[PDB]
Amino acid sequence: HWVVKLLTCMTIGFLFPMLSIAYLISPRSNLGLFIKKPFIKFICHTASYLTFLFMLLLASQHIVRTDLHVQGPPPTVVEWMILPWVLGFIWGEIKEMWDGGFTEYIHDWWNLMDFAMNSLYLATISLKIVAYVKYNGSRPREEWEMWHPTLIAEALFAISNILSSLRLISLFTANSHLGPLQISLGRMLLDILKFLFIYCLVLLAFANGLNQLYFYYETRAIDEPNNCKGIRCEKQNNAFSTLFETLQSLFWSVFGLLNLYVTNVKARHEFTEFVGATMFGTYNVISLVVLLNMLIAMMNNSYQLIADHADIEWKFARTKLWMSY
Amino acid sequence: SSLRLISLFTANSHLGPLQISLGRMLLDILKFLFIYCLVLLAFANGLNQLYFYYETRAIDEPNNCKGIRCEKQNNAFSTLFETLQSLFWSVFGLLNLYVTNVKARHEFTEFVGATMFGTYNVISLVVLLNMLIAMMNNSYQLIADHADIEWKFARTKLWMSY
Ligand SMILES: O=c1c2c3nc(n2Cc2ccc(Cl)cc2)Oc2ccc(F)c(c2)OCCCCCCn3c(=O)n1CCCO
Numbered sequence: 001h002w003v004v005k006l007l008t009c010m011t012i013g014f015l016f017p018m019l020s021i022a023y024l025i026s027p028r029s030n031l032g033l034f035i036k037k038p039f040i041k042f043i044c045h046t047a048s049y050l051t052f053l054f055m056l057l058l059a060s061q062h063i064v065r066t067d068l069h070v071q072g073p074p075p076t077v078v079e080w081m082i083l084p085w086v087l088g089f090i091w092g093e094i095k096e097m098w099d100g101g102f103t104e105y106i107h108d109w110w111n112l113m114d115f116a117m118n119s120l121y122l123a124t125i126s127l128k129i130v131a132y133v134k135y136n137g138s139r140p141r142e143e144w145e146m147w148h149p150t151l152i153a154e155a156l157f158a159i160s161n162i163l164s165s166l167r168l169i170s171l172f173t174a175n176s177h178l179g180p181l182q183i184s185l186g187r188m189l190l191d192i193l194k195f196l197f198i199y200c201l202v203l204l205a206f207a208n209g210l211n212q213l214y215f216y217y218e219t220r221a222i223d224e225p226n227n228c229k230g231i232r233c234e235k236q237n238n239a240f241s242t243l244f245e246t247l248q249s250l251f252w253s254v255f256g257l258l259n260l261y262v263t264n265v266k267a268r269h270e271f272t273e274f275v276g277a278t279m280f281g282t283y284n285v286i287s288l289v290v291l292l293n294m295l296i297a298m299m300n301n302s303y304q305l306i307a308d309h310a311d312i313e314w315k316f317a318r319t320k321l322w323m324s325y
Numbered sequence: 326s327s328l329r330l331i332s333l334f335t336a337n338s339h340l341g342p343l344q345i346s347l348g349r350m351l352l353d354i355l356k357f358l359f360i361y362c363l364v365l366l367a368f369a370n371g372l373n374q375l376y377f378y379y380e381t382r383a384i385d386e387p388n389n390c391k392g393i394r395c396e397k398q399n400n401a402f403s404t405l406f407e408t409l410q411s412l413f414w415s416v417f418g419l420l421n422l423y424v425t426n427v428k429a430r431h432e433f434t435e436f437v438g439a440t441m442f443g444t445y446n447v448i449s450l451v452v453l454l455n456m457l458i459a460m461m462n463n464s465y466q467l468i469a470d471h472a473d474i475e476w477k478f479a480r481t482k483l484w485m486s487y
């Protein structure tokens with residue numbers, strides 16, 4: 001169970017390029033016709049993906065590169081060899097839509113994660129060539145603008161890797177131990193919706209009074225130490241001034257990362273600070289003691305009804321998988 | 326050498342059936358450990374790829390201290406070895422919030438950094454720890470029965486060695 005059948009599969013994995021080119025040159029030989037088997041196709045398709053996912057860790061941490069002061073540099077050798085993968089993925093996505101129903105295509109929920117990836121990969125080429133053609137020269141990095149093309153053309157490339165690495169969860173249905181765990185996790189995500197609705201109402205209700213009470217004492221940045229304004233500084237300040245900051249403030253205090261001296265106002269007024277502190281203290285009891293003690297009690301009940309018939313719904317899925325090769 | 330006094334609990338009637346019930350709980354953390362490991366190496370990459378342009382040195386910092394564990398934390402998302410220790414310690418609450426603020430005045434990067442840091446907490450502290458409880462609760466109520474047939478077997482196997 002653990003040695004020979006574990007080694008044969010690793011052995012076949014390495015042979016995928018030569019098998020591909022052999023099928024390409026002659027499809028009726030004895031080396032050809034050996035890839036038209038439902039298991040070998042699976043192994044080859046699975047092995048052709050870890051190579052792509054491993055040629056991306058080299059671009060994250062530079063193995064060898066040049067200094068970073070030019071506006072638009074030419075692409076390096078690692079980036080020259082990634083285009084074929086993207087082009088092949090787009091061509092395959094377009095081809096799958098042809099010999100299949102359009103309504104039949106849109107009924108799968110994974111296609112919704114293969115559209116966003118493709119869009120975020122397609123924007124970067126244009127955003128990079130624009131800066132390669134327009135700009136020229138070199139200047140230090142501490143004087144660039146906030147909306148420079150070279151700065152916007154890296155955030156999308158950083159975001160895309162996360163959505164491209166979380167797709168190894170659709171392979172758990174081919175195993176007997178990790179199989180029935182995805183089916184039990186699929187049910188838990190139908191319990192957070194209603195509590196999310198109630199929490200959203202309870203949060204926009206409170207996000208209004210606190211903003212209405214504190215919008216008289218808004219200072220500026222130059223009059224503050226170290227020219228820092230808002231939370232995320234070393235000394236937090238101006239936390240209930242606008243409506244966009246009052247919504248980020250209330251979110252971060254669920255985990256415990258908000259201090260208590262942010263309710264103290266200048267100008268000596270004492271009657272306002274007490275009402276502010278009471279409004280801040282009433283919001284914690286409703287959210288941390290009454291609501292999180294109900295998710296547990298409901299998810300406990302929901303789990304004990306899906307434990308049964310958990311093998312009739314995994315075999316259906318893995319049968320639907322096999323029938324595609 | 327001091328944690329080996331737990332193999333003597335099988336010779337007593339009160340502490341005996343407790344080790345047998347603890348032995349079953351350790352077969353539930355494995356799969357959640359697998360899923361958590363995948364969810365953590367997925368996120369440990371983007372944050373490292375976004376912040377590796379602003380790595381300073383030690384001599385230009387106060388008191389010649391670089392990294393977390395100083396009095397004023399700094400350089401938390403520079404390399405891949407620090408990004409993996411940073412994400413671990415934040416589960417308990419020992420990481421501050423001013424570590425996502427970069428120099429050089431750029432404002433559009435800090436927002437994306439803060440959003441990436443904030444999305445990782447909801448998936449780990451609200452959706453996963455609320456499932457270990459609900460599954461360990463079910464696993465315990467099936468081993469409570471026949472808990473005296475498996476303790477006497479063990480203590481019989483003990484006696485037969487002397
Ligand atoms: O300190 C409190 C507080 C409190 N409810 C309390 N306490 C403690 C307390 C007790 C007595 C006194 Cl003479 C002063 C403070 O205690 C109780 C006492 C009886 C209760 F039944 C109860 C809470 O729960 C009711 C719902 C919780 C509302 C929190 C408001 N609430 C509150 O917003 N603050 C913040 C005020 C900022 O200064």
Ligand SMILES: O=c1c2c3nc(n2Cc2ccc(Cl)cc2)Oc2ccc(F)c(c2)OCCCCCCn3c(=O)n1CCCO
Nearest residue numbers: 196200244247248249251252436439440441442443444447
């Ligand atoms: O502050 C948040 C935040 C948030 N989801 C939120 N909020 C609070 C919020 C509400 C409204 C506005 Cl206009 C701005 C912030 O609230 C919601 C609102 C509806 C939801 F359905 C929900 C969360 O849960 C979705 C999954 C959680 C993703 C966290 C992202 N997420 C997040 O990464 N940050 C960090 C940003 C750093 O500045």
Ligand SMILES: [Ca+2]
Nearest residue numbers: 093110111114
């Ligand atoms: Ca697809």
